[PDB]
Amino acid sequence: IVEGQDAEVGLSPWQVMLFRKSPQELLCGASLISDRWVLTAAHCLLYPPWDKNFTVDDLLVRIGKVEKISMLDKIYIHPRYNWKENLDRDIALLKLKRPIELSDYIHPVCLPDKQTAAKLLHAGFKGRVTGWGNRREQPSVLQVVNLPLVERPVCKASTRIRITDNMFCAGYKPGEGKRGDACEGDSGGPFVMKSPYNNRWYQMGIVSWGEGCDRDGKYGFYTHVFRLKKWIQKVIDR
Amino acid sequence: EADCGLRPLFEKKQVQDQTEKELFESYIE
Ligand SMILES: O=S(=O)(O)OC[C@H]1O[C@@](COS(=O)(=O)O)(O[C@H]2O[C@H](COS(=O)(=O)O)[C@@H](OS(=O)(=O)O)[C@H](OS(=O)(=O)O)[C@H]2OS(=O)(=O)O)[C@@H](OS(=O)(=O)O)[C@@H]1OS(=O)(=O)O
Ligand code: NA
């Protein structure tokens, strides 16, 4: 996170870190959505231009900073994930080897329904991005930044990448008075918003892509969680 | 999960975090 601040203890108990198993290195952020399911970006697992195709034997997740380390049973990547062109449908689900124990530092975030998404997804409304990634383009504390949702035509005019309805963008405009963005290591992490209707946090987006971190006139792009909920529902079953 | 989105160290203890108001401020313009 660029231009953020230290998060208070227990601020994001759904925070998950995706780690390379060997050699061990932080790869991506992720989010806890149940005691057994973890949400992240597809490009964190599969990205052929960088020769990246991680399996369950290549990865570990870290949750709760009290801390929990777990293997993955299965990886689910959206079948229409489009890495060649624009990272359309940049979403993947990680099934944990076994269900984890919940605590003060480990707690799942909510997924939004139609009504929640209609209420919260308006240009100007701020969401929250958290992660352990770079401060500049190695924090010892989870970092947090709050960022405003941006008008879709402003998002499209900021980049040459074709923007689909499965993406939104967020971040300050040049001269808006503030800065901030996800950066290397935060990708796959959650963009959350607090609902006034029921006092709960919902994950609205997944850090997907940007063109540099915290650049004037550029915005972060996030996988639109509600619009991919049909696929989320299908794989999780229950 | 019935208890999703409610953090034990905040909402469950009726303590709001330090930058929550920034989000609620953005809701009313
Ligand atoms: O609260 S949710 O976000 O979970 O919203 C529920 C989803 O309902 C959808 C699902 O589309 S579907 O996959 O094609 O079925 O809309 C449509 O289906 C539901 C349920 O169908 S079912 O056969 O009864 O199970 C209907 O809602 S419900 O009242 O039955 O719960 C919808 O009717 S209605 O519009 O609510 O009156 C029905 O809409 S439609 O006739 O296909 O237009 C999704 O709505 S959608 O986002 O417009 O596609 C909702 O979102 S979801 O992500 O698919 O869960
Ligand atoms: Na920017």
> Does A104 participate in catalysis according to the annotation?
no
What is d(CA A180, CA A213) in angstroms, rounded to the nearest whole number?
8
The domain over range A13-108+227-238 is classified in CATH as 3.40.50.720 = no
Q: Which CATH class is domain A1-12+109-226?
A: mainly beta
Q: Considering only CA atoms, which of A93, A127, A80, A116 is closest in space to residue A222?
A: A127
Q: Identify the domain containing residue B12 by its residue range.
A: 1-29
Contact of B7 with chain A, judged by CB distance below 8 Å, is answered with: yes
Task: Say how many domains are in chain B.
Answer: 1
Contact of B28 with chain A, judged by CB distance below 8 Å, is answered with: no
What is d(CA A26, CA A5) in angstroms, rounded to the nearest whole number?
20
> Does A107 participate in catalysis according to the annotation?
no
Query: What are the structure tokens assigned to A161, written together?
Result: 């990448």
Listed in sequence order, the residues at least 6 apart from A94 whose beta carbon sits closer than 8 Å to its beta carbon are: A18, A30, A37, A38, A39, A40, A59, A61, A72, A74, A75, A76
Secondary structure of residue B2 in the 3-state scheme: coil
Q: Which amino acid is at A59?
A: L
Resolution stated for this PDB structure, in Å: 2.2
Largest pairwise CA distance in chain A: 48
> Does A57 participate in catalysis according to the annotation?
no
Ligand 1 contact via A8 beta carbon (within 6 Å): no
Q: How was this structure determined?
A: X-ray
DSSP state of B23: H
Whichever domain contains B8, its CATH number is 4.10.140.10
Q: Considering only CA atoms, which of A91, A89, A24 is closest in space to residue A61?
A: A24
Please give, rounded to a whole number of angstroms, the shortest distance from the CA of B13 to a CA of chain A.
11
What is d(CA A52, CA A68) in angstroms, rounded to the nearest whole number?
26
Are A30 and A188 in contact, with CB atoms under 8 Å apart?
yes
Are A113 and A227 in contact, with CB atoms under 8 Å apart?
no
**The one catalytic residue among A70, A88, A90, A224:** A90
Q: Residues spanned by CATH 2.40.10.10 within chain A?
A: 1-12+109-226, 13-108+227-238
One-character DSSP codes across chain A: -BS-EEPPTTS-TTEEEEEEETTEEEEEEEEESSSSEEEE-GGGTEEGGGTEE--TTSEEEEE----EEE-EEEEEE-TT-BTTTT-BT--EEEEESSPPPP-SS--PPBPP-HHHHHHH--TT-EEEEEESS-S----SS-EEEEEEB--HHHHHHT-SSPPPTTEEEE-PPTTSS---B--TTTTT-EEEEE-TTTS-EEEEEEEEE-SSSS-TT--EEEEETGGGHHHHHHHH--
